[model samples]
Target: MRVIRVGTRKSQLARIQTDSVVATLKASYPGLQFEIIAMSTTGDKILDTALSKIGEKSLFTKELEHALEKNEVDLVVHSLKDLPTVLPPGFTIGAICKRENPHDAVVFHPKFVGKTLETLPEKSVVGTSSLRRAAQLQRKFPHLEFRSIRGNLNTRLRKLDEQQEFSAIILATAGLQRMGWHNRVGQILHPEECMYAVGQGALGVEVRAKDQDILDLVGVLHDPETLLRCIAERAFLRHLEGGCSVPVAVHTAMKDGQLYLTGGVWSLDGSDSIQETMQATIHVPAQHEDGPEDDPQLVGITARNIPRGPQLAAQNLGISLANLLLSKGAKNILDVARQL
Candidate 1:
């Protein structure tokens, strides 16, 4: 019976993203109503500048969160990757929906629809707005040139089609799936080829931390595996970025009761790096969870229904991996990467 108000971006993808979340909540609680309010933010307003030059700490998330802080809306739907690892005070990611494919996808221009990144012509150009994506691909494909392209999915695709500058572009496979643009994805990059951002391929429902009722309502949407993996990934980024600006990438998985996390830190050119893989034994919480209610947004994600034991274990796993890398002089590379 609650008519919850939701804040979202005005872009087509954001609408589709909010619509899917609304659909889930409506299905879960029959007769519930949701009103979505979409608005543009700093991230959306600036298309000419590369997000990297603007300092992406919270470019996409801060404005929507301003609505959350002002009580303009009860909840906000966001791509998990856009939300920073450390959220502003009083806001928490109440729910992270089940993850889609977290790997990067290759979308080739119509002229070269069948060619992979490696198979593209010599001196070919690849477009991506992500430093993480650009860095990895630049290092792997010496023959191809990586450039920046920023805009919504429609605009980016239009540029790829109408312009002849780029032979292909890299994007999140999950986002393409959400837009129902399955035909655009030419190749799905493996974890080895390119690790994804901390929280890519997932949606985060952000809400006021003090609102227990809303948290409890949104809590049901949490996918436990993605929650654990994302927690580890976010924690890893948080600990590293706390010192300096660096391009970080991570990939996580659950296998045989062990959570595996592979984290990498690379320079702009991907000329050098510190990368490692670590695993921790973690237990899955059973149904009828009676966990304590003191979860205060671990790395901006709030999972009240999940047990603190495993949550802390996953957090520690990432921290431990970061500490290992730091000891091996990872900071030096990040520091060097920052000034470049």
Candidate 2:
């Protein structure tokens, strides 16, 4: 029998996600043993500074990555959106579990549970730090006011419910689901209503690039469709020079033989938003194995004909699209987002 150690943030949501992955692995390999190690990250400690101002490097990942480098744990589980586009030299994302509800949700204060955003009283304060959410929602619902609220899921909701500071708060639906608080979700925001943060609902497992054994073991859990879609999304974000801190957003999927990517950029204050869609298809020979293969062309074959996966792919598409948008002055979105 083999043992694996998984590191994760101490937040309830993080632990729930980690536990879910562990449960799946346990069922698949009943003989294997696993341990979940929880620790706090700098992001959890610094609740005062707005996250967009902190710069998105490694707020939640630094300690866990350090522990992995020191061999303290065999792997770490991360909210895919929180992981940066570029990885440290010796590490690679080992597995991306099938995504949950990737869209954003409106979790209203209990008093307003039956009401939707449209019916909220004028000037209702909605707390959300996501530039994507802020920009899109403010544009759609000018009647409601958007403000920044920073904290772990539990803390944020506690403040919203007990403090009367917020009438509602926007959060990733998947986060609520993972924590078994789906009952708290008041409304699921569609893309037309409020675009979610890129990679909002996926879980990623990371390990050292050199740890082929653990990588191969975890690889058993990889979802190829999910991986490719996210790769494109991530590539877009990386090309835009954006990270978790920037106001960029995306949604992607695969269909037929073509990969369809739809996502875009937004200025912090909701004055500017640019969205676009694109597709690409490369035919592949259809006997599938496991892990990334050598042929780059083969990498994309059947890419779009899948069930789901988007965070990375949408990010990549957004980055490339941003570059294109930059030529036409859309880069100002990133520039202005930084100052906000």
Candidate 3:
């Protein structure tokens, strides 16, 4: 009987996600035991300032990574969007669970029940903590005002219900669903209206690069479709070097054996933007019983020296889409966005 220690933030949502992972692992490895370790990260402590203004990439993840580095925990569970596209040198994502609703949802204040963004009174203040959401919504609903609201899902909802200033708030549907508050969702935004953040709505299991045992165990939870879709999205974000401060968004789909990716970058004020779509026929690699699961050194494979198939195809699609955007003035837009 082996005991595995899992690391997570102290937030209620974080504990829920960690518990879900542990449950899945327990079912698979009945002989093993697990422990849940909750700790606070910088993001958890800093509640007063908006995330975009803080201008840090590891606000929610660094502390957990630090714990892993010290061997205090065997693994850490994270909201995939919060994890940077490029991980630190010794860490790798062991698994990406099946994604939940990857789109954004609107939760209206109680007084404005049944009313959505379109029907909200003029100049109604819509609260959101993401520049990605604010920029896209600003462009689509220019008549409405956007403001920042920070904290966990429950806290945000409470503020929306109790505060008179906010007409509604925007959040990731996946979080609300995982928290078992699906009824709180007033409307699910279409990708056409507001694309989601990179790797949104997915849960990632991150472990030390050299821990082959933990890697192999956690890898069992990976969802092929979700992994491929997120790989493309993360590649796009990594190439652009965009973070929460900039308004970079994407939507990906797999249909009829083809992977399609639509991505864009926008200025802070939403006055400027560029978007493009590309598709590729993805071939999921057949597993060889004797072959290695994944090479620890292979970060983002593009070279022909290694076996190439679905993973490389997905990565290429993202890189190609990002290059297309860069050629079409995405760099200029992102540059301006970072300054604000």
Candidate 4:
């Protein structure tokens, strides 16, 4: 029997997410034995400071990546949005599973049970740790005050419920649903209200680049449509060099074999911003012709036929959209946001 070790953050939600993956694997490969190794990350250690002020792309992933580098764990599971667009050398994402709700959700305190952001009283306080959320909300709903709130989902919820500091808080719908707290959501924010982070609502499995066995094992979970959507989003982020600190956001969708991407960049104060939408009909793979394999390809001929057309087209579309933003002075907006 094969003994596979999985590394994950020690948080309750992290363990839940890890177990979901393990359950999927166990059902698919009954002969393999699995072990869960919980660890703490920098993001978990520091709760008082705003993530933007920390200015680190790998706050939640560096420690886990180090373990993978040392061969301490065969793979590490991550909330795909927390991962940087460009991975460190020697590490590659082996699989991207079907995404959950990619939209943001409004979780209100019991006192404000029936109120949404629009209906909340004047000067109502809304808590969030993301610059992207603050920037957009500030522009759209100036009457509401945005404040920084940090910690795991449970901790944040406790703060909202116990203390009267905030009238409401913002959280990912996906996280709440996964934690079995779906009833907590008072409202779901539409894309018009707040664009989502890249790779939001997805789980990615990271493994060493050369580990063919593990790569093949995880590949079974890959959802082609989800992978293509994330490819476009990540490519957009990579070109902009955006991090958690800057207010960069995206919304992507697939319909009738076409991928539509709407990307935006915002100033720290939300006074200045740019938003653009672009679409591309992704290329459907032709009947069998050998081509360059996606990195960390699966076993010999078994995986060679894996489709690459949609991913390739998605990448090109992302680059094209990024260049469009650049031509319209996106770099200038990004530079100012970074310095703030």
Highest TM-score scorer: 1
Ranking by lDDT: 1, 3, 4, 2
Worst 10 residues of 3 by lDDT: 297-306
- Per-residue lDDT, model 4, residue 268, is 76
In model 4, state the lDDT of residue 1. Answer: 57
lDDT of 3 by residue, 1-340 (tens): 5579999877788889999989988899988889888765355336445354553546558778888999989998888887777788788887888898999999999988898799999999999978888999999999999998876688889999998989999999999999999999999998777999988999888898777788778876777787788888988888877644689999999988899999988887688889799999985433422336454332321112223457768888999999999889888887777788
Compose the digit string of candidate 4's lDDT tens values, residues 7-106.
Answer: 9877788888889888888898988899888765345446334354543546557778888999999988888887677677778887787899999999
| lDDT (0 to 1) per candidate | 0.84, 0.73, 0.81, 0.80
Of candidates 4 and 1, the better by lDDT: 1
Deviating ranges (above 4 Å) for candidate 1? 40-60, 242-245, 286-288
Clashing pairs in 4: none
Tell me the TM-score of model 3. 0.90
Which of the two, 1 or 4, has more TM-score?
A: 1
Number of the predicted model whose lDDT against the real structure is largest: 1
lDDT of 1: 0.84
Q: What's the TM-score of every candidate structure?
A: 0.92, 0.84, 0.90, 0.89
